[PDB]
Structure formats: structure tokens, C-alpha cells
Design an enzyme around this catalytic site. Structure first.
Site, PDB file in Angstrom:
ATOM      1  N   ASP A  72       0.756  -1.228   0.000  1.00  0.00           N
ATOM      2  CA  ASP A  72       0.000   0.000   0.000  1.00  0.00           C
ATOM      3  C   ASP A  72       0.777   1.262   0.000  1.00  0.00           C
ATOM      4  O   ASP A  72       1.651   1.455   0.834  1.00  0.00           O
ATOM      5  CB  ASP A  72      -0.866   0.051   1.230  1.00  0.00           C
ATOM      6  CG  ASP A  72      -1.774  -1.086   1.298  1.00  0.00           C
ATOM      7  OD1 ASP A  72      -1.262  -2.214   1.393  1.00  0.00           O
ATOM      8  OD2 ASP A  72      -2.993  -0.855   1.211  1.00  0.00           O
ATOM      9  N   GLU A  86       0.085   0.032  -4.995  1.00  0.00           N
ATOM     10  CA  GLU A  86      -1.203   0.692  -4.853  1.00  0.00           C
ATOM     11  C   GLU A  86      -0.936   2.171  -4.767  1.00  0.00           C
ATOM     12  O   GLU A  86      -1.131   2.816  -3.748  1.00  0.00           O
ATOM     13  CB  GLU A  86      -1.924   0.191  -3.603  1.00  0.00           C
ATOM     14  CG  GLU A  86      -3.222   0.909  -3.237  1.00  0.00           C
ATOM     15  CD  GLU A  86      -3.168   1.513  -1.855  1.00  0.00           C
ATOM     16  OE1 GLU A  86      -4.216   1.557  -1.184  1.00  0.00           O
ATOM     17  OE2 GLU A  86      -2.062   1.870  -1.409  1.00  0.00           O
TER      18      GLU A  86
END
Lengths: 649, 678
Positions: B395, B424
Site C-alpha cells: 500500500d 497501490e
């Protein structure tokens, strides 16, 4: 392009990933742009380090077997996401190279945070977790500036520590005074060593130069019987006062050694010679001499010496034809058989390249005996530089191994890194842009065939390759007679003479352009009628001038305007609006327009005064029988601005 | 780009000058360009020296102080002057490296002119020396071919040495027999080996993959009262069969560890929680656990492993979400104070990134104690791969120093380079793309933000251009993601947006709930999901929606079927776009190098009524001539047609919302000519 605490990718300019340096002239603003990035959302910063590394010349191509081998500067962000722009201008000629440094910066992230949080309406209550760092912030910023001027750290770091008014506690640290010290000695944090990229910085002439082409044989003239007389060196030392006026600072000559006598070429593109024929100058080698030896009919090697000094104290620069093209009566065709493309019989083939053929020459071979040939060739150039040669006109360089080119370039420039080059080749851009990369200072372009405003849009391609290649806009040379000139008439001279001066900071002219010569040998051909490289062509400049049909008073005007405007030494400044084009100046500021406002530096609506150099017409802005052109001093742009559209990205 | 007798310049592909290698999957064709030139006029040719060395991973970034740290093949020229085109295809996983070799060839440059000159009509008189090189031409190459097979050399060199008719004397050296003598074993004269730039090859799964995303809590279901009940590892292992058919081979999951209890967030994105609200899974760290611990209401970790087996023998691949933080009840928030940006009081400020506020989580500090951090985080991941986790979604890496990453990724792929990661990130390209370079396998693209028929291309224009580096992972939806488009387009624009991700993206994704059609926000204009499962638990009856015959699952299995059926839908760089004379329509084609397979998809921008159009093809990229007719069959629907280059094509979104058909295939020689960079 490296990896680290700060990632520094896409740092322009770098040539062929660094196998070569970028190419520049001294006192020229050179920009270097660079995308760099990081993590989170905190502020990032950078540096442009530029140091001088003498005159020693790096070998950019690997030679064949036997033959041998600091100013921290600032970078201001632009308007493109994460790319940065700094700018250096090299003062000394010799080896220079730029390295980009990357460091994240906090002085400005909280100094902004201060801005945002109190115009959003906050007191001392919420933020003092954020400024007690600020004193601790300025605590090592302290360690990074001198002890005597430490007292002036302590106050504001105390003017942060002691309890006061939101506005009162910060005001000390906001002042220019505090601002002054960290724009000069900042706290550089988490630094990533960038890759050290190069730029070799030549003389100016290497970029702003006024070239000419004349034949000295041709200076012979007419005799009591009215035949064209051969010209000698002495005959030529008289010919320059004329040229030296026009504006040129470098004068190139067609080869000046003995021409052979056999397979020799006759008058009007002939292989059949007649009694008393001169022939091709570029076909080097008769019996009494070679590449270092002079032609008996221009004089001797010493009388040659008297000749170049005549340029010395006139302000001109001889730029010799260095041709590698032998006539079969050469002092090497017998001497060195090796260096040829032998036929199995024992003969060497006439130099041909389609569809133009030359019997009167033979083509050299380095893949035969590279070790032998190479050295002789410098022992010929070394001969010349001594004589006072600072420019070498290089003929057919796409026929001659670039390796070779790059190896020599080294050797001369290692000795004297002042002698400059010109590559006069017209070929595949993948090949064409290839040479100067290897180090050819200057270049010849295909300017000729390009006639359309959408071709000249040349310009787009040229300005982009300013980092390496440097083109010379010769409006004319002996080999091709461009048909425009033949049809646009005496008017078409002006206009083709106008791109070359205004578009080209270094440009060229062959003798006779002034005299409006447009006759070819036959209809449709672009070969000159009765070529001077097959003939002596004495010509009367006085007449045309006196009879008031010379270009001379105008090409001094043109050269006058060139030296008058510093924008016309520079390449990258060129802009194209709506042929009509503008160029700005970095140092002085000087913009000129030759007949898109951001490049003008002035706002979309404004009214401005533009002054004429061709005419003399000053006007407020927003006949080829009189003036076919119109080149104007545009309104200047100030220091801070000049550098902002100077931005590479 | 280096210097020598043969100059090989501008050799694509090269990453940040090679400061990163190029990037690949197995069994894939990679094109390699390199301009090379020389001086003068005679023919020059080239070679691509290609190596596999194994899997040792180069650290592409300089780490911090304390922390630790063949087969010769050809370059066939193109149609841009002095640029050449070859293409190599890797069979093994690990690092490969390319070198361009350039050598002048006297033979083929010589045989041309005999033709030009015998077609100028001249006899043996003129040419008889020029062929006197020719016998001593291949007498080198005679030296360059085996003694058992000179026999096939001396002959033609003699059939030119003895005096005869130029054609019969010349015809010999020309024949195909000898041509192969020159097509396999040549005389490279004066050759220069170029800079060896590299190419890493992952497993194929790494780019041609079907991603799906589910929450484990929400499949818990209901009690006798029918309120959302919690779920365990086994309970979810029941949902996979459902998933197992749809077409995926990759399943990413939400954090499965103890979420904190302090400052934590309640239902519908609240900062105000209730006794027993689940809240944010990305909010790691309660008393009962940290990064290595499963969360107790799901059971414990042994209960996690047989699960991954349940997936691995359904053909699917489990991939946990790798977020990098802590909720204030983490057992490190007290253990180690170090790795946080302490405010001078004894506090650490909450992690936010604009315009989103995140109270319940705080940001680690690598610039306090890098040595201290680094190893744990990797000692965190080193843990899970053992279980059989071969994919990790990571992330917002645009938040974490790029330093760590190249180091992080390095040591892991030094061990096992089968395990793949995913970025991401939605940052600026200068950053977003910066990421995949240092080594992040895949990429998130803001494809979402691209909605226009002119965005749907310029998005493509970019992605296809950088097939060498970044791989977009085109998820049709994410927890944080739900667009005005789909919310307005009704049930049809689900399809259309689901094919923008599926056909364009060799690796693409889907969030659970997409099959059951949920499109509704917290409030009007907001782009977050309604009663977020990320603050609430969402069990769902898929069985219902399909059984009564309006679920999309049967289409995304149809969609997942053709994906596995046609190899044109693995590649990034082959993608092309023919024009259409309808503003609300769009149309693009993609071909295959290895197989030849072409597939073409025509979709509309209307998510409503019948809106007809016609077609403009660039037939060369189609591999077909401007004039011909070809028989084309539809795979979702089932309709054959014979078309030309100009042709009429009407659509109705109340039936079938797009047109995807396998186009006629392309031959080896051409397909490779169409991936040809120029």
C-alpha cells in the site's frame, strides 16, 4: 539516472547515456533539467554542482590494436510535475561536467505550515508541538553556519522558545534576515549522489562564427591578353581586406597542396584535360608534394606563413581543407601501397560513391594498415596547427571511420583544445547526428533541399540538438547549385542569405554569392557553370559594388546585425510564431524578431516598440525592391525571466 | 549506446540508463532496437547476445550506511534508417541480459551489385575482378564453417575461380543452399559488442492474472436473528468455490490482524465508534496482536494455512495486503518508541495524507532508526511466504522512502523470486512510474480517473508505450473506489467499465460486490462506499442475485474465459486503436507475436440506448490489406460476419454492450514486424 534517498531520474542533458559530453561554448547559459522524487508529502530539494577540469581531452572512442588509447548551484522548480531547472554558464574553455545532488528540505515545509495554519485561523494552542521542533530545527541549522554568526541563530530559536504571541514568536524566524542565511547556507538532509554528467566547453567562434569560402588559385586574375591567371599565396594576402570587412572571422580554403597530373579532370566537369589545366583541388597529390607540402603555384611553405599572419592582424581565421583523397601521382601511392583498396591484380580502384564518380582520386584504407595511416595523418595536422590553424575543414567524414575521427580529435585537443571543427556532411540523421556526438565541433546541414516553411519548421529539429551537434549554415558551396537560387533570382539571394544568418549563429558563404552567380553547366543541373574547382575564376567585386550591384554592403549589414545582437550566437532561444521567427538572449536579455507571447516575455494584450536594423523603423505593436526583410529589436526580458523559458522541460 | 568501428546508438529498451533493468514475464516476445551505423556505403548487420544467469537480484538502490547490502541471435532491420529489429523470448524465471553486436559483412553487400550490374546488362569482362574478391570472400567464411562442410564452400568459390559465363559462374554463389551457409554461419568482420543491458523474467502469472478482492469478516453471515455475524478462515474457504469458477487465479485479502481499539473508526467512516464496532482493518495493532498476529475473532494462524491450500488446489493464489503502519494499541507503540516522529511531549502525531484524515493510525519512522526497522518489516514478510503466499499487495509506497523498497524487494527476490508485489499508488507519474522502476512488479493506474473516449485512449497510449517498465493493475473497483460513471450508467456501465479493465489489462482486478451491483455513496457526490465493510461487516447473498438471473458473475466468468482462451490479451505494447466515426463509441485491436492471435473489442460510451456506428480500420496493424474481406466471429454473443475495411456496425446496450471478436491471425514474419518498435 540513479537510485537513493532521493531518486534523481531523467537529468538533461546527457548524450548517448554519457559515452559523450554535451557541447557548449564559453559564457553560454547551459540549462540542466531533472525530474526527482520521494515519499510521503513533505518538501524536496536539489543542487547543481559545476567544477572545472582543465583542458585534458577524454578519448570517446576505443582505438584499434597497435594504435594507442566546485560550485554548488541552485535549481528552481518549474511548472512540470517534479522536474527542476538550474543553469550554468562556463567561463573557461576546457573540461567541465555537471552533477546533480538531491536532498529533502524542511525549512520550507513548516515555514509553509505556519502560513497555512494561521490564515486558517489558529492560535498558539494547537501548533506548538510543531514549532518546538523549530527551535530544534534551527538547532543544527546552527551547526551548519559559522560560530560568529551563531548569535543570530540563538535569538529566533529563542524567539521561538520563550512564550510569546503566535505572530510574535514566528516573526523573527520569517524575516529576510533569517531568510538570508538559509538561502546561502541551508540544511541539506538525506543526500543522494547523482551521476556526474559532462559538457565540453569550446570557444565562441565554435558557435558564433562568420565563415567564408574563397579560392586563392582563383585570385590570379586576368593577363595582358585577358586570360584567367593563377593565383598564388601573395595574390591572396591582398584578397582579404575585402572579405575581412564583410564580417567574417574564419576563412576556409579548398585544399592547398600540389594537384596530380594524371586522370586529372578538365574544364566543365571533364575527365579529359587540356594543355594547362588546374583541375580538382580535392584530388590531392602530384609528384612534387603531398598533404603537408604546398602547391608550387601558390608558393612555398614559408610564403604560406606570411599569408596566415595577414589574417592574424585583420581579425580572420583560416580554416583549411583537410581532404583524404589522393591523385595517382601521390607520394604515397607508390610509397604506401598498403593504405588502399587494392584490386587483386595490384591496382587500386578509383574512388566512387553513387552516383557521383571520381576517377581522379583513390580512397584510403584503415582496415588495411590502421597502425601506419593514422599517425601520418596527425603528423600532417600537427604540421598545420603550428602554422596557425585553429579550424580544420573536414571533407567526407561519413566516408572515414568515426573511430578514427574520435581518436584524432582527442590527440589534437589533448594538445591544443583550442582548434575547432566543422563537419561538412549531409547524410542519414542517424548517421548525421552521430558524428558531433563523437566530437565534431561544428556541422553542415541539408539546408539546401529544405525550402518550405514547413520544412524550415529544420528549425524544430536543429534547436533541439543544440546540446551536441553544431550546424553551419553555408548558404553556398562548390558541389551543389541549389535550384531555388537559380529561379528566385537576385531576390532569392537575400532571403536564403537571411535564414542562414538569423537562423544560424555560425554560418557560411562561398565567394561569389555576392556577385549573384546562378548559371549551371546545363538546364536543370545543380552543378555550377564552369566550376571553380575545375577552373580559376577571377572575379571583379569592385564593379558590382561600384555598379551598385553587390550584396557586400548588405552582408556586412547582416554581419553587422549579427555581432550587434547576442541572441544570434545562441541556438536554443529560437522561437517560431504565427518565415517569421524570434530569438532571445540569456545574459544581456536581447530578443530579436525576424520578419507566441510567453517567449516574448510580455503579456497577451500589451503595446510595444520594435526598432529596425534593416530599415530603421521604430513602431508600436501588439517590398523586395526596398527591403525584402525586416529584423527587429524586440522588447527585452529581465534576468529572472530570461532563464524561465530557458527551461529545458 | 557505446562507441567503436560500428556505432550502435539508441539501443531500446534501457531503464534510467540501465540503473534499473527492463522488465518481463516468461514465454513472452521482447523486441529490442538499436540504431547502428558506420561510415561510407557498404552493408552492415547485427546480433543480439542474450544471457540467462539465474535469479541473483541486483540491488538497484544504494542502501543506508549500517543496513546490509549462450545463444547468439539476430537483428533484422526495420524501416527507419539504421534502426534494426530483433526480438527474443525468455523461457526461464530470473535475470536475463541483452547485448547488441554489430559487424560489417562484405558478402551480402557484394552480391547485391552483381544484380544491379547484371540488370544493367554487362558481361564477365567488367565484373571479373569484382568476383575475384568473391572467391577469396567466402574463403574467410570457408575458414568460418566446418571442415566436413567446406565441401559445400570450395565448390562455388571454384565455380567462380574457373572461367565461364557470368550467370552460370555467378549463379552458384547466389543459390539458397549457400544462402543458408550464410544465414546461419556468417563472417562477422570488424564487430562491436554493445552494452549489455538487462531483463528480469518473472513467472507468467505475474502479468497475465485475474485478481479478485474479498473481506473475510463479511462472509461470516448471519445468526438466527439475521444480523451480520463474524467469519473465520474456514468459513471463507467456503466462498472460494464460488470465486474458484469465475476465472481468477489471484486473491488479495484485507489485513487479518488485530486492529486497534484506541481512537478507532466506527461504521460509515465514523471517528465515533460503538461497543463492538469492527472498523478499519488497515488500522493494525491492538493489545492482542501486531503485524505477525492474526486477529483473535478469526481464530489463530494455523487456521490460516490449510486455507491457502484450499485455494492452491482450486487453482487460485492468496495475496495479503501490505500496509505499513500502527493503531495506537500496537504492541510496539509501547515496546519501541523509536520508529515514530515523536512530538516533543512524548506523543506521535496522526498519519494523514490530504485530503483524508486518519486518526486511528500513525506513521513509522525509517529516518529515526532505519537499521532497527528494516529487518523487522522484512522479518515480517519472510514469515508469510513460507505459508505459500506468492503475491503481496503493497500500500501507497509513495509514502515510504524509495531506499527501503529496492532493498526490501532485493533480499526477498534473492531468496525466492517467484513471489510478486503490487503497487497501490495513485501519485504523479513522475512518482508513480518511479516506483515500478526500482522494482515494484505491478502498478495501479488512475485508469479510473480516465472516462472519456479521449481518456480511454490517452491512458492506453501511455501504458502500451511503457510495456518495458510499469504494469498497470486495472482493478475495476477498490474499497476506496466507486465512480459517478457507474453510479449513473446503471447496470450496463458495470459491464463496459469491467471490460475497460479486462481487455486492456493483462493483469486486472475485481472487488467483491461488483457481481451483485452495488453503486451508492455515503452522500451525494462522495466517492466512498455506502456502509463501508471497512467500518461495518457486509455478508452478501450472491446465490440470490445469480439464481434469479441478474448477477454479473456469469459474465465475468465469460470474460475470464476468453482471457484464458486468447493470448492477445496478455500484452501491453501490441495494443492498437483503429478509428470510429462515432463520438460515443470506441474501438481497438491487439495481436499476438508467439501465436499470432488477434482480438478486437468495440464498446460504446452509452450505458443506455441503442446507439449505432461504422468502422475505420488501420489495416496494416490488422495484418490485413486495406481492401480485403474477412470472416469474423463474436464470442460473447456468437455472430460471424464478413467485413472489409470500411464497414457498418450498429449497437444496442439493452442486449449486448460491446463487440469483442478474434480477428484473423498474423504470420511469424509479420507479427514480429508489427511489434517492431519502428
Amino acid at each position: 539516472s540513479v537510485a537513493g534517498r532521493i531518486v534523481i531520474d531523467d537529468v538533461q542533458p546527457v548524450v548517448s547515456n554519457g559515452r559523450y559530453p554535451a557541447k557548449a561554448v564559453v559564457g553560454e547559459v547551459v540549462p540542466v533539467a531533472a525530474t526527482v522524487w520521494r515519499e510521503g508529502h513533505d518538501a524536496v530539494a536539489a543542487t547543481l554542482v559545476v567544477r572545472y577540469h582543465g583542458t585534458t581531452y577524454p578519448d570517446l572512442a576505443d582505438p584499434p590494436p597497435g594504435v594507442p588509447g566546485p560550485q554548488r548551484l541552485p535549481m528552481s522548480p518549474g511548472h512540470t510535475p517534479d522536474v527542476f531547472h538550474g543553469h550554468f554558464t562556463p567561463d573557461r574553455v576546457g573540461l567541465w561536467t555537471y552533477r546533480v545532488d538531491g536532498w529533502g528540505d524542511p525549512i520550507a515545509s513548516w515555514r509553509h505550515n505556519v502560513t497555512a495554519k494561521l490564515d486558517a485561523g489558529q492560535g498558539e494552542s494547537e501548533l506548538n508541538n510543531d514549532l518546538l521542533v523549530g527551535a530544534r530545527l534551527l538547532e543544527r541549522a546552527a551547526t551548519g553556519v559559522p560560530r560568529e554568526l551563531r548569535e543570530a541563530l540563538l535569538e529566533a530559536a529563542a524567539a521561538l522558545r520563550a512564550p510569546g504571541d503566535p505572530f510574535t514568536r514566528a516573526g523573527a524566524a520569517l524575516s529576510a534576515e533569517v531568510s538570508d542565511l538559509l538561502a546561502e547556507y541551508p540544511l541539506r538532509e538525506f543526500v543522494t549522489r547523482g551521476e556526474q554528467y559532462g559538457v565540453w566547453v569550446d570557444r565562441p567562434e565554435a558557435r558564433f562564427s562568420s565563415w567564408y569560402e574563397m579560392f586563392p588559385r582563383s585570385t590570379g586574375g586576368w593577363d595582358a591578353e585577358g586570360r584567367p591567371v593563377h593565383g598564388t599565396f601573395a595574390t591572396a594576402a591582398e584578397a582579404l581586406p575585402r572579405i575581412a570587412r564583410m564580417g567574417f572571422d574564419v576563412v576556409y580554403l579548398p585544399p592547398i597542396h600540389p594537384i596530380g597530373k594524371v586522370h586529372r579532370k578538365g574544364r566543365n566537369n571533364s575527365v579529359t584535360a587540356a594543355p594547362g589545366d588546374v583541375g580538382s583541388p580535392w584530388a590531392i597529390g602530384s609528384d612534387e608534394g603531398g598533404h603537408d607540402a604546398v602547391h608550387p603555384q601558390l608558393g612555398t611553405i614559408e610564403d604560406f606563413d606570411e599569408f596566415v599572419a595577414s589574417a592574424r592582424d585583420l581579425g580572420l581565421e583560416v580554416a583549411l581543407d583537410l581532404a583524404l583523397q589522393c591523385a595517382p601521382d601521390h607520394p604515397w601511392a607508390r610509397e604506401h601501397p598498403e593504405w588502399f583498396t587494392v584490386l587483386p591484380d595490384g591496382s587500386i580502384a578509383y574512388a566512387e560513391n553513387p552516383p557521383k564518380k571520381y576517377q581522379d582520386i583513390y580512397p584510403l584504407n584503415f582496415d588495411n594498415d590502421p597502425a601506419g595511416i593514422y599517425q601520418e595523418v596527425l603528423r600532417v595536422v600537427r604540421f598545420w596547427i603550428s602554422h596557425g590553424v585553429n579550424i580544420f575543414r573536414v571533407d567526407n567524414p561519413h566516408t572515414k571511420p568515426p573511430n578514427f575521427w574520435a581518436w584524432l580529435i582527442g590527440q589534437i585537443k589533448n594538445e591544443n583544445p583550442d582548434v575547432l571543427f566543422l563537419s561538412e556532411a549531409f547524410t542519414r540523421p542517424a548517421r548525421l547526428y552521430g558524428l558531433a556526438k563523437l566530437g565534431f565541433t561544428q556541422s553542415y546541414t541539408y539546408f539546401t533541399w529544405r525550402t518550405s516553411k514547413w520544412e524550415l519548421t529544420f528549425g524544430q529539429e536543429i534547436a533541439a540538438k543544440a546540446d551536441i551537434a553544431r550546424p553551419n549554415l553555408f548558404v553556398n558551396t562548390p558541389d551543389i547549385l541549389h535550384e531555388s537560387l537559380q529561379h528566385g533570382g537576385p531576390g532569392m539571394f537575400a532571403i536564403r542569405a537571411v535564414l542562414a544568418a538569423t537562423m544560424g549563429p555560425a554560418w557560411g558563404v562561398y565567394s561569389g554569392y555576392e556577385l549573384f552567380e546562378n548559371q549551371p553547366v546545363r538546364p536543370g543541373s545543380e552543378e555550377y557553370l564552369n566550376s571553380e574547382k575545375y577552373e580559376l575564376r577571377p572575379r571583379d567585386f569592385e564593379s558590382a559594388l561600384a555598379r551598385g550591384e553587390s550584396l557586400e554592403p548588405f552582408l556586412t549589414r547582416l554581419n553587422e546585425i549579427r555581432r550587434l545582437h547576442p541572441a544570434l550566437r545562441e541556438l536554443r532561444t529560437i522561437r517560431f510564431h504565427h518565415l517569421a521567427y524570434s530569438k532571445f538572449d540569456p545574459g544581456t536579455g536581447d530578443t530579436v524578431l525576424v520578419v507566441d507571447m510567453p517567449e516574448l516575455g510580455m503579456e497577451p494584450y500589451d503595446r510595444f516598440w520594435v526598432r529596425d536594423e534593416i530599415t530603421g523603423e521604430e513602431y508600436q505593436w501588439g517590398d523586395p525592391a526596398k527591403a525584402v526583410a525586416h529584423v527587429l529589436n524586440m522588447p527585452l526580458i529581465p534576468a529572472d525571466k530570461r532563464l524561465q523559458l530557458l527551461r529545458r522541460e
